[PDB]
Design an enzyme around this catalytic site. Structure first.
Site, PDB file in Angstrom:
ATOM      1  N   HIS A  41     -16.996 -60.177 -74.563  1.00  0.00           N
ATOM      2  CA  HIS A  41     -17.072 -61.225 -75.585  1.00  0.00           C
ATOM      3  C   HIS A  41     -18.323 -62.089 -75.467  1.00  0.00           C
ATOM      4  CE1 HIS A  41     -14.723 -63.795 -72.588  1.00  0.00           C
ATOM      5  NE2 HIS A  41     -15.605 -64.681 -73.011  1.00  0.00           N
ATOM      6  N   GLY A 143     -17.314 -71.128 -69.598  1.00  0.00           N
ATOM      7  CA  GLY A 143     -18.448 -70.504 -68.949  1.00  0.00           C
ATOM      8  C   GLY A 143     -18.140 -69.725 -67.685  1.00  0.00           C
ATOM      9  N   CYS A 145     -16.249 -67.058 -67.391  1.00  0.00           N
ATOM     10  CA  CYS A 145     -15.946 -65.648 -67.568  1.00  0.00           C
ATOM     11  C   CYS A 145     -17.020 -64.782 -66.918  1.00  0.00           C
ATOM     12  CB  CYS A 145     -15.822 -65.311 -69.042  1.00  0.00           C
ATOM     13  SG  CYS A 145     -14.290 -65.961 -69.680  1.00  0.00           S
TER      14      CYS A 145
HETATM   15  C1  LIG Z   1     -14.791 -67.511 -70.362  1.00  0.00           C
HETATM   16  N1  LIG Z   1     -15.911 -68.048 -70.152  1.00  0.00           N
HETATM   17  C2  LIG Z   1     -13.655 -68.338 -70.955  1.00  0.00           C
HETATM   18  C3  LIG Z   1     -12.769 -68.899 -69.818  1.00  0.00           C
HETATM   19  C4  LIG Z   1     -11.669 -69.852 -70.380  1.00  0.00           C
HETATM   20  C5  LIG Z   1     -12.231 -71.010 -70.933  1.00  0.00           C
HETATM   21  C6  LIG Z   1     -11.269 -72.205 -70.480  1.00  0.00           C
HETATM   22  N2  LIG Z   1     -10.604 -71.668 -69.197  1.00  0.00           N
HETATM   23  C7  LIG Z   1     -10.809 -70.335 -69.119  1.00  0.00           C
HETATM   24  O1  LIG Z   1     -10.408 -69.635 -68.241  1.00  0.00           O
HETATM   25  N3  LIG Z   1     -12.821 -67.489 -71.794  1.00  0.00           N
HETATM   26  C8  LIG Z   1     -12.481 -67.857 -73.186  1.00  0.00           C
HETATM   27  O2  LIG Z   1     -12.848 -68.870 -73.689  1.00  0.00           O
HETATM   28  C9  LIG Z   1     -11.584 -66.873 -73.917  1.00  0.00           C
HETATM   29  C10 LIG Z   1     -12.300 -65.897 -74.922  1.00  0.00           C
HETATM   30  C11 LIG Z   1     -11.880 -66.314 -76.346  1.00  0.00           C
HETATM   31  C12 LIG Z   1     -10.997 -67.422 -76.228  1.00  0.00           C
HETATM   32  N4  LIG Z   1     -10.689 -67.547 -74.677  1.00  0.00           N
HETATM   33  C13 LIG Z   1      -9.616 -68.300 -74.053  1.00  0.00           C
HETATM   34  O3  LIG Z   1      -9.562 -68.249 -72.859  1.00  0.00           O
HETATM   35  C14 LIG Z   1      -8.653 -69.041 -74.966  1.00  0.00           C
HETATM   36  N5  LIG Z   1      -7.353 -68.583 -74.592  1.00  0.00           N
HETATM   37  C15 LIG Z   1      -6.672 -67.671 -75.472  1.00  0.00           C
HETATM   38  O4  LIG Z   1      -7.158 -67.320 -76.499  1.00  0.00           O
HETATM   39  C16 LIG Z   1      -5.311 -67.211 -74.983  1.00  0.00           C
HETATM   40  F1  LIG Z   1      -4.463 -68.263 -75.040  1.00  0.00           F
HETATM   41  F2  LIG Z   1      -4.904 -66.176 -75.764  1.00  0.00           F
HETATM   42  F3  LIG Z   1      -5.447 -66.815 -73.683  1.00  0.00           F
HETATM   43  C17 LIG Z   1      -8.833 -70.582 -74.850  1.00  0.00           C
HETATM   44  C18 LIG Z   1      -7.788 -71.209 -75.813  1.00  0.00           C
HETATM   45  C19 LIG Z   1     -10.276 -70.968 -75.258  1.00  0.00           C
HETATM   46  C20 LIG Z   1      -8.541 -71.110 -73.415  1.00  0.00           C
HETATM   47  C21 LIG Z   1     -11.738 -64.861 -75.884  1.00  0.00           C
HETATM   48  C22 LIG Z   1     -12.732 -63.842 -76.449  1.00  0.00           C
HETATM   49  C23 LIG Z   1     -10.282 -64.480 -75.550  1.00  0.00           C
END
Ligand SMILES: *C(=N)[C@H](C[C@@H]1CCNC1=O)NC(=O)[C@@H]1[C@@H]2[C@H](CN1C(=O)[C@@H](NC(=O)C(F)(F)F)C(C)(C)C)C2(C)C
Ligand SMILES: *C(=N)[C@H](C[C@@H]1CCNC1=O)NC(=O)[C@@H]1[C@@H]2[C@H](CN1C(=O)[C@@H](NC(=O)C(F)(F)F)C(C)(C)C)C2(C)C
Lengths: 306, 306
Positions: A41, A143, A145
């Site tokens: 992503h 950030g 990920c």
């Molecule tokens: C990577 N850098 C981030 C790590 C997240 C951010 C907050 N804490 C974490 O671990 N990953 C994301 O932002 C991913 C990404 C889109 C949205 N996302 C989420 O983690 C969201 N969660 C979900 O969509 C759920 F609930 F289905 F897990 C969010 C609401 C922003 C925490 C993609 C492509 C999944």
């Protein structure tokens, strides 16, 4: 003596972390030999992430669109491909700090260390378990990920986890290094169901052995039990069934302390039925299930890594 | 989201660990530029350690008696001296992996990461606090001495602890990197008194802020209190006094959450007087005091290191 939540030394993994930017999206990558692995992503805008078609998004990218930075050195990207939920960026430079390594897919109940990173730089290291519902209880921000989870065996780093996402309850989900999610999750920003979690019985038993090794022995009772009788009682308390494989893995701790596994099970059964009566074990007022039998041995026997 | 006990990345310190052997005694050393620092009791036999005269023992050693190994490379020793409880071995080779570093003496209540090592090789990393009685609750076995504690600031490693000894209750004692013990202890195998420990109030408050940041808010009450009134109530529960300096250090967390420090104190006072009524905060059934205000900020804001 003493017993702490202990992570593996992180240096071998630190030498592999880079920053990957595509457009305005930046996350972490793992640089091993001449390949950088990162969550796919990175190719999404914020709007894309609600319902992404990753294959379509990647079609429209070329190599030069990926800005890979190792410190203040840009690594030239000379190929790219997608494997499940991870991107692989071929670069023209092999990482001279690449350790001996493997990609492994771990089992629910197994633990690993996480090197949490931002912008390709390490923030900290902590220990996690793969929960029985295939989530982990981590600590991750925007950030993070591409941060990875790993175990070490002498000189060999076994990478088992790459971080992708957080469920709004503060639990975390990700993939192995082949890009396959742990659990029934997808990398899309939409609500998804996770199974109810359960307590990792074999790990609780390992931690009770750690307690005995450290002189915390008050909970040892005079009884034994059968494996069958233990599993019936433990099921009520949302403990996972204890298998003969689990009993066998507990053998080294059992032999070291001279406490039969089924005797320790009888002590655990009493704790589940009666509670801890205001007492602690190894400083905890709750039973701990994120130490594996190997974690206990490696900490209490001082196993080192090369 | 999420909140874990988090250590600093250990790689910069890993690159500094060596093995030091004198006679049949082997422990760890810290190799910075062309000096190796290690506990002075490497020069003792087991019998010497009951009542050592370190000055007399060192008189009878020469440089070549110290076998220093960095991996499978022996480092030639070309000088030696004793500084309080540490030995300094000058070697003919500077460590090319020496990070930017400082030697600091930390305050009771401050935390640090420990890289536990055996035979010059890292076993694991965990987070510790300097207790108010100048012990630490570590995890250390035979051969761990010379393992170090540290904090990182961007690229600079601040070394604050070197491990020397365990009291038979499973608590640990050591020195700063100038060889001066924390606490009223000496490096001799004889019984020694430690002060009664106390709870690090400012750290408990920091962790309650971490809890609010993570959505665990049930313990917030509607009251405020004075600093004076809080300290009278907390003294009964063996909490250290909260000073204005502590209030000032909590300012960033207070401003971030919009909860005044003295309001959080009123919530803590209720928890001390009433207990947690079977509930948890951040998964713990006990109040946690080994996160500093900076620990909370660095974890919840994703501070990274170079
Ligand atoms: C990577 N850098 C981030 C790590 C997240 C951010 C907050 N804490 C974490 O671990 N990953 C994301 O932002 C991913 C990404 C889109 C949205 N996302 C989420 O983690 C969201 N969660 C979900 O969509 C759920 F609930 F289905 F897990 C969010 C609401 C922003 C925490 C993609 C492509 C999944
Ligand atoms: C360094 N390698 C070891 C680390 C110890 C060993 C077990 N867990 C640890 O942290 N340090 C020692 O063995 C030191 C050393 C002599 C004896 N010693 C102790 O730690 C002993 N403790 C004490 O003497 C006491 F209680 F005063 F702290 C021991 C009983 C062996 C645990 C010297 C020179 C102090």
């Amino acid at each position: 003596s003493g017993f702490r939540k202990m992570a593996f030394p992180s240096g071998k993994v630190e030498g592999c972390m880079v920053q990957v930017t595509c457009g305005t999206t930046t996350l972490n990558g793992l640089w091993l030999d001449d390949v950088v692995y990162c969550p796919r992503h990175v190719i999404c805008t914020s709007e894309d992430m609600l319902n992404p078609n990753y294959e379509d998004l990647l079609i429209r990218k070329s190599n030069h669109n990926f800005l890979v930075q190792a410190g203040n050195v840009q690594l030239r990207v000379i190929g790219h491909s997608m494997q499940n939920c991870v991107l692989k960026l071929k670069v023209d430079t092999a990482n001279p700090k690449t350790p001996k390594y493997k990609f492994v897919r771990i089992q629910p109940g197994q633990t690993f260390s996480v090197l949490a990173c931002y912008n390709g730089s390490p923030s900290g290291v902590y220990q996690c378990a793969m929960r029985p519902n295939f989530t982990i209880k981590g600590s991750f921000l925007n950030g993070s990920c591409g941060s990875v989870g790993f175990n070490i065996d002498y000189d060999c780093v076994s990478f088992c986890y790459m971080h992708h996402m957080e469920l709004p309850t503060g639990v975390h989900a990700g993939t192995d290094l082949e890009g396959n999610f742990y659990g029934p999750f997808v990398d899309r920003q939409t609500a998804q169901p996770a199974g109810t979690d359960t307590t990792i019985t074999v790990n609780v038993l390992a931690w009770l052995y750690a307690a005995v090794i450290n002189g915390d022995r008050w909970f040892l009772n005079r009884f034994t039990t059968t494996l069958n009788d233990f599993n019936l009682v433990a099921m009520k308390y949302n403990y996972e069934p204890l298998t003969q494989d689990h009993v066998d893995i507990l053998g080294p701790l059992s032999a070291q302390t001279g406490i039969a596994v089924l005797d320790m099970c009888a002590s655990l059964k009493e704790l589940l039925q009666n509670g801890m009566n205001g007492r602690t074990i190894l400083g905890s007022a709750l039973l701990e299930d994120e130490f594996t039998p190997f974690d206990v041995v490696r900490q209490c026997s001082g196993v080192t890594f090369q």
